Amino acid sequence: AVTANTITVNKDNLKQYMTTSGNATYDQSTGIVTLTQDAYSQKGAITLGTRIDSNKSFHFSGKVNLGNKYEGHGNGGDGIGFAFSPGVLGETGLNGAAVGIGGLSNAFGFKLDTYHNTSKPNSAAKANADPSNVAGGGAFGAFVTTDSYGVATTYTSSSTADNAAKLNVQPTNNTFQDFDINYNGDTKVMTVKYAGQTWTRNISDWIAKSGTTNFSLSMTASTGGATNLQQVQFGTFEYTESAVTQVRYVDVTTGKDIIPPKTYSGNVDQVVTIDNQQSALTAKGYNYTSVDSSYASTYNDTNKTVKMTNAGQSVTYYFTD
Ligand SMILES: [Ca+2]
């Protein structure tokens, strides 16, 4: 019956659902992910190890420290990107003008950008210049999309709802500001709020452009020659799983879990080998009886494999005392 769970990541279970990379470090007592310290040439990221189903809602609620320096006020950069990618789990965008989003293909997201790249970045940067409507000083926030080659474009428009905009509250002091990304699975509306300032857009076009309805989440920051302490504080991230299989190990007499249910996560179409844990159950005094795969249509009992779909699957292995 349960195929795809609605998960809430919080500071205590973060390492179970997410993985830090590069310069990123995590303090579990505070829920603070430090993506970069305020130093040269850093890059750090955290990625969510399960695909997010955009047919369902999802919500990040937490705080962000963007640093103490920005365009026109010291040499601050590069900014923090929050990316949703149709590509494989665990991938992250590039450093510099890409702001953690550029480099992913057909992706979309939001960035807090403290370094205005006024002139066109070179080809390797995977980013177009930041827009003139945010030039002239101050950090800015914006939606961002990338094309099939991973090139990032800061989103602009004639609308106050979604146009790129200089931050109402500039990062002068290393203060954590409220940050929220809220997404509605029915209306496809994504709403982003940083320090009292809001951006909102129906993202159904970017979703359709991506070729899929489920996404790999990454949060990535870098420093170049320009620097800043860049941190995200959990806070919580709530989402519904895609491309998972639940595997249960159940007492055939009672109907109770013998060991905890296991969730395998993968990319869509990935063939994943699942484990009936036979030896382990034997050690607990249990012998294999049967399997119920009726909630996993791709289940292959000969190879012990499932093929991840857009939705969830569940396989139950039964054992007897
Ligand atoms: Ca920039």
Residue numbers in the entry: 253 to 573
Q: What is written in the article reporting this PDB entry?
A:
S. aureus encodes a 2,271-residue SRRP termed serine-rich adhesin for binding to platelets (SraP), that is involved in the pathogenesis of infective endocarditis. S. aureus SraP, a surface-exposed serine-rich repeat glycoprotein (SRRP), is required for the pathogenesis of human infective endocarditis via its ligand-binding region (BR) adhering to human platelets. We determine the 2.05 Å crystal structure of SraPBR, revealing a rod-like tandem organization of four discrete modules: a legume lectin-like module, a module with a β-grasp fold, and two tandem cadherin-like modules that create the rigid stem of SraPBR. Further structural and biochemical analyses reveal that the legume lectin-like module specifically binds to N-acetylneuraminic acid (Neu5Ac), which may mediate adhesion to host sialylated receptors.
To further investigate the plasticity of these junctions, we determined three crystal structures for each of two consecutive modules: L-lectin&β-GF (Phe245–Lys575), β-GF&CDHL-1 (Ser494–Thr663), and CDHL-1&2 (Ala576–Asn751). We superimposed each of these three structures over the corresponding two modules of the full-length SraPBR structure, always with the C-terminal modules aligned. The results revealed slight twisting and/or translation with intermodule angle changes of 9.4°, 11.7° and 14.6° for the three junctions, respectively. In detail, residues Val496-Gln498 in L-lectin&β-GF, Phe571&Thr572 in β-GF&CDHL-1, and Asp661-Thr663 in CDHL-1&2 undergo slight conformational changes. The N-terminal module adopts a jelly-roll fold with a β-sandwich (β1–β17) core architecture of two antiparallel β-sheets packed against each other. A structural similarity search using the DALI server revealed that this module is most similar to legume lectins, despite sharing a sequence identity of ≤20%. In contrast, the L-lectin module has only a Ca2+-binding site. At the apex of the L-lectin module, the Ca2+ (named Ca-1) was embedded in a 7-coordinate geometry. The seven coordinates are from the side-chain oxygen atoms of Asp365 (bidentate coordination from Oδ1 and Oδ2), Asp382 (Oδ2), Asn369 (Oδ1), the main-chain oxygen atom of Tyr367 and two water molecules (Wat1 and Wat2). The interface between L-lectin and β-GF is maintained by several hydrogen bonds including Asn257-Glu493, Arg303-Asn519, Arg303-Ser494, Leu341-Asn519, and Asn466-Asn562.
